[PDB]
């Protein structure tokens, strides 16, 4: 059934599972027309498909051409997501295929279930958690590859960099969701915290800066402070 605070440790057991987030698949800018009406212009998007145990990210870039001449795009986007997720599963070796797929929005359940009928033994699960994966496009290297794409493309990342050499998956996911929650609540301040010092470098093959253990504790504290504040600045407390 649904995933929530009570069964949180299941994410890090040894059953392969993937989170699928569709919030950045269909992306538009809204603008006025010469005649003073409103129109949308699509921009490139992405499916965020993540193994929370290993950090492996399957970033399927959604090129704007996929919407050309199509109607009801927000509905199509969910089915396109499910089509691509199912294609990814079929492309993986059997021993790499997930035993569960957890969708971050409940509207993905029926489209994914229908596209995965061929996989009766893969459980499609919602979650009650309010995960911050929409903020993936606040990670500069991910945003950069999505916007530069000129055709559909799959790009593979490890969203944890090398962190698993030193910390557990539980701790790595907690750090990731903290960073992404911060980026979502106040991107500019989150990014100042991470990137205010250009000598803490991001390795060419990484997404985040090469913080020592001690610098990660300071960083994480600063992100908590940001989230608590924004929550005041918002509700005035």
């Amino acid at each position: 059934g649904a995933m929530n605070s009570s069964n949180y440790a299941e994410l890090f057991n040894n059953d392969i599972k993937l989170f699928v987030d569709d919030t950045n698949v269909y992306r538009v800018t809204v603008h006025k027309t010469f005649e003073g009406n409103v129109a949308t212009k699509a921009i490139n998007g992405c499916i965020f498909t993540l193994n929370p145990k290993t950090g492996h990210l399957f970033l399927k870039i959604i090129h704007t051409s996929v919407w050309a001449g199509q109607k009801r795009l927000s509905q199509l986007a969910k089915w396109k997501t499910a089509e691509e997720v199912s294609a990814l599963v079929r492309s993986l070796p059997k021993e790499e295929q997930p035993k569960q797929i957890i969708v971050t929005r409940k509207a993905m359940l029926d489209p994914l279930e229908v596209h995965m009928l061929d996989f009766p033994n893969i459980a499609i699960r919602p979650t009650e958690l309010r995960l911050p994966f929409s903020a993936a496009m606040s990670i500069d290297k991910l945003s950069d590859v999505v916007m530069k794409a000129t055709e559909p493309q799959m790009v593979l990342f490890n969203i944890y960099d090398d962190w698993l050499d030193r910390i557990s998956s539980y701790t790595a996911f907690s750090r990731l969701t903290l960073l992404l929650r911060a980026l979502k609540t106040n991107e500019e301040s989150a990014k100042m915290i991470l990137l205010s010092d250009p000598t803490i470098t991001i390795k060419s093959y990484h997404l985040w800066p090469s913080f020592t253990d001690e610098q990660w504790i300071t960083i994480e504290s600063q992100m908590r402070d940001l989230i608590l504040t924004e929550y005041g600045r918002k509700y005035n407390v």
């Binding site: 089915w79 489209p111 229908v114 061929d118």
Partner: protein
């Protein structure tokens, strides 16, 4: 005109015949129901005064044989039984219809309700949903589950309705996932009508029979089946025009006949609101929409 003769009435019981019903007292002198119209299937059904658990009954057609009821004190129910003989079925009733204690199948001559509820229902199809081939009539009760229910436990006692499942490979063509899930026309017209049912009359027959089992016996799996067969039509963008017109009539008379106090359990809010207001055929069920709104505006 034909008659269903009763050996006796040893236990107090409410007896239904089609949409009619009457109370019989313990050991009341009662030998049957006469004037039963030829040309339609019928159902005769029972609810004991002591145990309202288990409404049960028998679908039958008078053209298929001479049928009577006798109570079994071991199994504790009124049984429909078959007696082939004009030297017995005639020799016994000819005595019973000189002593007048039956009520008329009480059909008002203006009334086409029963025809309208059973237009497409045919005993030969009932006997395939209710498998018991040694009898010409078919027993149903409140508790019998459907094939589809048992997949999700005694098969001999199942209702073998046609399995409909909108999230199944039968329903969804590979490569047409989104198309086929949002427009079920493929599944209705190609899979179900052309493939399984062969024609719309057989489809409507099973739909009508499911409704009647839901109404007369409170059979929950039947109600599920009735709503599934409605929803498959309403969720198809492409339905023959004659089917839509006929479905509107079918549903109108089912809604007309439903007991007003049973709408809470027999009617599925989601299916009806989707069918009448959101679906492809939202504008194609005028008679059904009008009666639903004037009679059950709460559900909507």
């Amino acid at each position: 005109m034909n008659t269903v003769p009763f050996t006796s009435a040893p236990i107090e019981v409410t007896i239904g015949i089609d949409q009619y019903s009457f109370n019989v007292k313990e050991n009341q002198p009662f030998h049957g129901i006469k004037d039963i119209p030829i040309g339609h299937v019928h159902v005769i059904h029972f609810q004991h005064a002591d145990n309202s658990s288990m409404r049960y009954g028998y679908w039958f057609d008078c053209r298929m044989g001479n049928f009577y009821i006798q109570y079994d004190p071991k199994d504790g129910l009124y049984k429909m039984m078959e007696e082939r003989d004009g030297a017995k079925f005639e020799n016994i009733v000819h005595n019973f219809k000189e002593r007048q204690m039956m009520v008329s199948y009480p059909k008002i001559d203006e009334d086409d309700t029963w025809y309208n509820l059973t237009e497409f229902v045919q005993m030969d199809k009932i006997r395939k949903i209710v498998r018991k081939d040694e009898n010409q009539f078919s027993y149903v009760d409140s508790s019998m589950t459907t094939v589809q229910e048992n997949e999700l436990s005694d098969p001999a006692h199942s209702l073998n309705y046609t399995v409909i499942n909108f999230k199944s490979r039968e329903a969804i063509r590979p490569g047409h996932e989104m198309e086929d899930f949002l427009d079920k026309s493929y599944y209705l017209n190609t899979v179900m009508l052309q493939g399984i049912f062969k024609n719309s009359s057989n489809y409507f027959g099973e739909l009508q029979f499911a409704f009647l089992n839901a109404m007369f016996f409170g059979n929950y799996g039947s109600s599920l089946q009735w709503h599934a067969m409605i929803e498959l039509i309403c969720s198809s963008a492409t339905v023959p025009k004659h089917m839509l017109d006929k479905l509107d009539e079918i549903l109108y008379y089912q809604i007309k006949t439903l007991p007003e106090q049973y709408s809470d359990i027999l009617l599925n809010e989601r299916v009806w609101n989707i069918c009448l207001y959101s679906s492809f055929q939202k504008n194609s069920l005028h008679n059904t929409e009008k009666i639903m709104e004037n009679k059950y505006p709460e559900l909507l």
